[PDB]
Amino acid sequence: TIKNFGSNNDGKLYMMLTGMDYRTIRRKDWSSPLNTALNVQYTNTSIIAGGRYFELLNETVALKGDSVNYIHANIDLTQTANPVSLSAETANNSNGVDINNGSGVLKVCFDIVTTSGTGVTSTKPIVQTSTLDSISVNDMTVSGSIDVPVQTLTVEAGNGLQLQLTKKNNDLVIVRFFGSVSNIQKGWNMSGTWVDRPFRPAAVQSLVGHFAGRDTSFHIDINPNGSITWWGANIDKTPIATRGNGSYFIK
Amino acid sequence: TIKNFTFFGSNNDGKLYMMLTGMDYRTIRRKDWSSPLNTALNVQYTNTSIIAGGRYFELLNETVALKGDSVNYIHANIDLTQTANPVSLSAETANNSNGVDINNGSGVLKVCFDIVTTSGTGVTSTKPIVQTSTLDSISVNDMTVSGSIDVPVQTLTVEAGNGLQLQLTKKNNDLVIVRFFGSVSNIQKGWNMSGTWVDRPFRPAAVQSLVGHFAGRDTSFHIDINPNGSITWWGANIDKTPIATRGNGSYFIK
Amino acid sequence: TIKNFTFGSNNDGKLYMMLTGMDYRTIRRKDWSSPLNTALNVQYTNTSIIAGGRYFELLNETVALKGDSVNYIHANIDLTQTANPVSLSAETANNSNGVDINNGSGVLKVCFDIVTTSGTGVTSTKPIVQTSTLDSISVNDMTVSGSIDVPVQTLTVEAGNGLQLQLTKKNNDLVIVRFFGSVSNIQKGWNMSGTWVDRPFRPAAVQSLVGHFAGRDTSFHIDINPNGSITWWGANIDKTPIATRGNGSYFIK
């Protein structure tokens, strides 16, 4: 059975409070769903979809065998007896239908159940997405991963030197050295392209590199203006391969 | 028109809603279900929901007149004494948000939610005010950030001794990048540098070997930052003539 | 006094808990005005609390404290006590019990404040943290005043030829490699003859990591290849080992 404990304005209100759109859910299994043959029984699961709260209380959905089943909550607000029904479908058919601003049936997938010919072999929930703008927090613990913006830049610095720069969170940069340097003196600026503004550090950064197949090393300074100063020893006309990773903060 | 739902207790629900979403009186929740329409020096909110002070209301074809050649700060104003129309919009020359607690006392709440810049003839750009979620501790599985994460940063300059200087920057109380400066002289391999030890908040759990480079040379050194904060020299021996020491090395505290 | 409001109260309770991402072991709490500390008492002037998705207000509500003690202030919710389901207690420990009052019977106890006293009055107060338990967050900007804890994995590799690597990976992305051991019998371009880097630490692209020979002016680098093998790119080393040290960093992604 399904209990359905409203107004369009409350639907919108609740969606805004929790930061959900029409393509996700809030979901809590208070007790575990139970698998029997080609069926899942939701014993006590609460769902919020489109800001509308409902409960799955010993509600069984029947499955297709040897398949990945996409379990959907389907909300039809005019079906005043049973507004919510469950379906098992061959694809994620979530439709993003706005049931608080317009007519229509909201379909939203919340579970993925894989079956053999005779029973359930695995279950994976659909993620519950909280879409937020700016967060001020004291502490955070992450069990998976944080995805931050990444930008890349290849710089032909001059004299054969190449830098491949990767910047994450607009702050941490790792520079990978490539190419082969020749015709440069200590203290000389390299003769090629300056580092693009978004990768320039606030203060001069000395990055250590290594000459491949040798026991010798160099460093370069990436200056705040984007210029690059050579601080290895003088190199004559024979190019020497330059390699290594160096890291700096922009901020 | 403005549809006023959480009004005429409404103050108890207001407080409840503010608490659930983590908002104070100086921010909003806001959703344009359809785009506002800009026409000459006017913005027409076609279908926008706002929560201000935990009070939910809708702007349905509600137009605000704008000042020309100006940055217009669009405010929602909530005055519970104006029983017939407790919410109104204004376009103002500054952000005049006032943080007034309308759920516990009298007063008019003003909160800016849009910034609309105009030429002489119409809207040239619109930028919403950010919706701030003020949270204490978060446990999350995964996060995607489109802008940036700001984490705490601490810096320390250490006169390590023998002319070596370290400038340490620590972020999230964990990742440290050390920048070498100064010039080293009169030191042997294996000796502790004769100066100041690294302050406790920058000390690593395990010894960290940081590679540096001698400016203008093909030669390098490393130092160890020991868990006790001491710094051990692991370049070759250096005589009386100082040699300039540079380079960035990174380590984790934890 | 305690004024109760959220008392289908069970369904609204679960609804509110789900909207804010709270379980039965935390609260939402806001002092709209400052509590008053008066001798061995705290007077909550105007404080709202949500516990188990139930909202209530502490209005001129005084809790007597033990002297020279750390007092754990609890909200206690017993839905069977219809006329006054909520009461406050000051206790010698955090005795929060996580009782599910919206699905089951029982008294929920949840600590929300820690009030420390001298012999005569309050010396400090510290609120209990309000925990938001969320699944996936999509955000524009975030500011953190404390710290972010991300996953950390470590790996020690007996790489071959005497070279040892200690790798630490954070957020499944940033790796810092610490070199140890002493290397011998290797040439430039040769793969180290030991254990390859485990799959979870392998980079998408070849990473050159610079190291230093302890007590010397000389340096080397190794390449960690996407297949997990490690290629020597120092000068050739004969039979006599040389101690290898240093930190190098790379991104996996």
Residue indicated by tokens 């580092």:
A195
Q: Fill in the DSSP letter of residue A128.
A: -
Q: How big is chain A by its Cα radius of gyration, in Å? A: 29
C131 near B CB under 8 A: yes
Distance from CA of A64 to the nearest CA of B (A): 30
Out of A141, A146, A215, name the one closest to residue C235 (CB).
A215
How far, in Å, CA of C219 to CA of B217, rounded?
13
The count of C-alpha atoms lying within 13 angstroms of the C-alpha of C104, restricted to the half-sphere facing its C-beta, is 10
Q: What is the Cα C90 distance to its own chain's centre?
A: 28
Question: At a CB cut-off of 8 Å and minimum separation 6, what does A154 contact?
Answer: A162, A163, A164, A165
Residue A91, SS3 per DSSP? coil
User: What is the full DSSP assignment across C124-171?
Assistant: EEEEPP-EEE-SEEEESEEEESS-EE--EEEEEEEEETTEEEEEEEET
Chain C residues inside the 8 Å CB shell of A209: 210
CATH 2.60.520.10 corresponds to the domain B1-130: yes
CB contact under 8 A, B213 and A208: yes
The b-or-e profile of C33-71 (16+ CB within 10 A means b, else e) is eebebeebbbebebbbbbbbbbbbbbeebebebeeebbb
**What are the phi and psi torsion angles at C76 (to 5°)?**
-120, 125
Out of C20, C29, C174, name the one closest to residue B20 (CB).
C20
Token output for C56: 């209530």
> Measuring CA to CA, which residue among B189, B236, B202 is closest to residue B217?
B236
Distance from CA of C132 to the nearest CA of A (A): 9
A124 near C CB under 8 A: no
> Measuring CA to CA, which residue among B166, B164, B163, B148 is closest to residue B204?
B166
* CA triple B114-B119-B122, angle to 5 deg: 70
Chain B residues inside the 8 Å CB shell of C132: 22, 135-139
How far, in Å, CA of A218 to CA of A211, rounded?
8
Q: How big is chain B by its Cα radius of gyration, in Å? A: 29
Token output for C200: 């979870």
How far, in Å, CA of A186 to CA of B43, rounded?
61
Both ends of chain A: CA-CA distance in Å?
Answer: 56
Token output for C137: 């967050």
Q: Can you state the angle between helices A8-18 and B10-21, rounded to 10 degrees?
A: 40
B104 near A CB under 8 A: no
Residue indicated by tokens 């053999």:
A116
Strand A146-147 versus strand C152-160 pairing type: unpaired
Distance from CA of A203 to the nearest CA of B (A): 11
Q: Fill in the DSSP letter of residue A126.
A: P
Do residues C179 and A174 make contact, with C-beta atoms less than 8 angstroms apart? Answer: no
Q: Which of A130, A188, A207, A217 to mutate to test the interface with B (most CBs of B within 10 A)?
A: A217
Declared resolution, Å: 1.7
Q: 10 Å Cβ neighbour count for C90?
A: 19
Write out the H or E segment, with its range, that includes residue A14.
helix A8-18
What part of B 184-223 touches A (C-beta under 8 Å)?
Answer: 211-213, 215-220
What part of B 33-52 touches A (C-beta under 8 Å)?
Answer: 33, 47, 49, 51
Q: Can you state the angle between helices C9-20 and A8-18, rounded to 10 degrees?
A: 40
Do residues C198 and C155 make contact, with C-beta atoms less than 8 angstroms apart? Answer: yes
What determination technique applies here? X-ray
Do residues B52 and B101 make contact, with C-beta atoms less than 8 angstroms apart? Answer: no
A125 near B CB under 8 A: no
Sheet of C148-149, strands arranged across: C131-133, B137-140, A139-142, C148-149
How far, in Å, CA of B203 to CA of B137, rounded?
26
Q: How big is chain C by its Cα radius of gyration, in Å? A: 29
Residue A135, SS3 per DSSP? strand
How far, in Å, CA of A158 to CA of B6, rounded?
65
Out of C17, C136, C147, name the one closest to residue A139 (CB).
C147
> Measuring CA to CA, which residue among B33, C26, C60, B175 is closest to residue A174?
B175
**What are the phi and psi torsion angles at B74 (to 5°)?**
-85, 120
Strand C148-149 versus strand A139-142 pairing type: parallel
> Measuring CA to CA, which residue among A231, A65, C34, C25 is closest to residue B213?
A231
**What are the phi and psi torsion angles at B16 (to 5°)?**
-55, -50
Question: At a CB cut-off of 8 Å and minimum separation 6, what does A194 contact?
Answer: A155, A225, A226, A227, A228
Residue indicated by tokens 């302890």:
C214
Which numeric CATH code is attached to C151-253? 2.60.40.1830
Residue of chain B nearest C142, judged by CA positions: B149
**What are the phi and psi torsion angles at C9 (to 5°)?**
-65, -35
Which numeric CATH code is attached to A149-251? 2.60.40.1830
C104 near A CB under 8 A: no
> Measuring CA to CA, which residue among B106, B3, B109 is closest to residue B53?
B109
Residue of chain A nearest B178, judged by CA positions: A248
Do residues C115 and C73 make contact, with C-beta atoms less than 8 angstroms apart? Answer: yes
Residue A1, SS3 per DSSP? coil
How far, in Å, CA of B103 to CA of A93, rounded?
42
Out of B20, B103, B146, name the one closest to residue C28 (CB).
B20
Residue indicated by tokens 């941490």:
A172
How far, in Å, CA of B164 to CA of B187, rounded?
11
How far, in Å, CA of A178 to CA of A156, rounded?
10
Residue A161, SS3 per DSSP? strand
Residue A248, SS3 per DSSP? strand
> Do B1-130 and B152-254 share a fold?
no
Amino acid at site B100: V
* Architecture of the CATH domain A1-127: Sandwich (2.60)
C32 near B CB under 8 A: yes
Q: 10 Å Cβ neighbour count for A4?
A: 16
CATH 2.50.20.10 corresponds to the domain C1-129: no
A7 near C CB under 8 A: no
Write out the H or E segment, with its range, that includes residue A174.
strand A172-181
Do residues B56 and A13 make contact, with C-beta atoms less than 8 angstroms apart? Answer: yes
How far, in Å, CA of B250 to CA of C126, rounded?
36
Name the residue ranges covered by the structural domains of chain A. 1-127, 149-251
Sheet of A172-181, strands arranged across: A150-158, A161-168, A172-181, A240-249, A205-211, A217-222, A228-230
> Measuring CA to CA, which residue among C158, C198, C201, C199 is closest to residue C176?
C201
**What are the phi and psi torsion angles at A177 (to 5°)?**
-85, 140
> Measuring CA to CA, which residue among A28, A91, A22 is closest to residue A52?
A22
How far, in Å, CA of C189 to CA of A239, rounded?
18
Q: What is the Cα C185 distance to its own chain's centre?
A: 45
User: What is the full DSSP assignment across chain C?
Assistant: -EEE----HHHHHHHHHHHHT--TT--EEEEEEPPEE-SSEEEEEEEEEEETTEEEEEEEEEEE--TTSEEEEEEEE-TT-SS--EEEEEESS-------TTTS-S-EEEEEEEEEE-SSSEEEEEEPP-EEE-SEEEESEEEESS-EE--EEEEEEEEETTEEEEEEEETTTEEEEEEEEEE-SB-TTPBPSSPPPPGGG--SS-EEEEEEETTSS-EEEEEE-TTS-EEE-S--B-SS-EEEEEEEEEE--
User: What is the full DSSP assignment across A47-67?
Assistant: EEETTEEEEEEEEEEE--TTS
Chain A residues inside the 8 Å CB shell of C136: 127-130
Output the furthest CA–CA distance in chain A (Å, rounded): 87
Q: Can you state the angle between helices B10-21 and C9-20, rounded to 10 degrees?
A: 40
Question: At a CB cut-off of 8 Å and minimum separation 6, what does A197 contact?
Answer: A226
Q: 10 Å Cβ neighbour count for B210?
A: 26
CB contact under 8 A, A219 and B246: yes
The b-or-e profile of B41-65 (16+ CB within 10 A means b, else e) is bbbebbbbbbbbbbbbbbbeebebe
The residues with which A244 forms a beta bridge, in sequence order, are A177
User: What is the SS3 assignment for chain B?
Assistant: CEEECCCCCHHHHHHHHHHHHCCCCCCEEEEEEECCEECCCEEEEEEEEEEECCEEEEEEEEEEECCCCCEEEEEEEECCCCCCCCEEEEEECCCCCCCCCCCCCCCCEEEEEEEEEECCCCEEEEEECCCEEECCEEEECEEEECCCEECCEEEEEEEEECCEEEEEEEECCCEEEEEEEEEECCECCCCECCCCCCCHHHCCCCCEEEEEEECCCCCEEEEEECCCCCEEECCCCECCCCEEEEEEEEEECC
The b-or-e profile of C149-181 (16+ CB within 10 A means b, else e) is bbeeeebebebbbbbbbebbbbbbbbbbbbbbb
Q: Fill in the DSSP letter of residue A127.
A: P
What fold is seen in the domain B152-254? Immunoglobulin-like (2.60.40)
* CA triple A148-A153-A159, angle to 5 deg: 150
Token output for A13: 């209100």
How far, in Å, CA of A165 to CA of A156, rounded?
11
Strand C141-144 versus strand B149-150 pairing type: parallel
Checking phi first, is residue A81 left (phi over 0); if not, alpha (psi -120 to 50) or beta?
alpha
User: What is the full DSSP assignment across A177-232?
Assistant: EEEEE-SB-TTPBPSSPPPPGGG--SS-EEEEEEETTSS-EEEEEE-TTS-EEE-S
Do residues B109 and B25 make contact, with C-beta atoms less than 8 angstroms apart? Answer: yes
The b-or-e profile of B129-149 (16+ CB within 10 A means b, else e) is bebbbbbbbbbbebbebebbb
How far, in Å, CA of C114 to CA of C119, rounded?
16
Do residues B215 and A210 make contact, with C-beta atoms less than 8 angstroms apart? Answer: no
C136 near B CB under 8 A: yes
> Measuring CA to CA, which residue among A64, A69, A60, A62 is closest to residue A113?
A69
Do residues A180 and A239 make contact, with C-beta atoms less than 8 angstroms apart? Answer: yes
How far, in Å, CA of B130 to CA of A132, rounded?
10
How far, in Å, CA of B33 to CA of B42, rounded?
19
Q: 10 Å Cβ neighbour count for B21?
A: 25
How far, in Å, CA of A25 to CA of C101, rounded?
23
The b-or-e profile of C236-252 (16+ CB within 10 A means b, else e) is ebeeeebbbbbbbbbbb
Residue indicated by tokens 């800001």:
A51
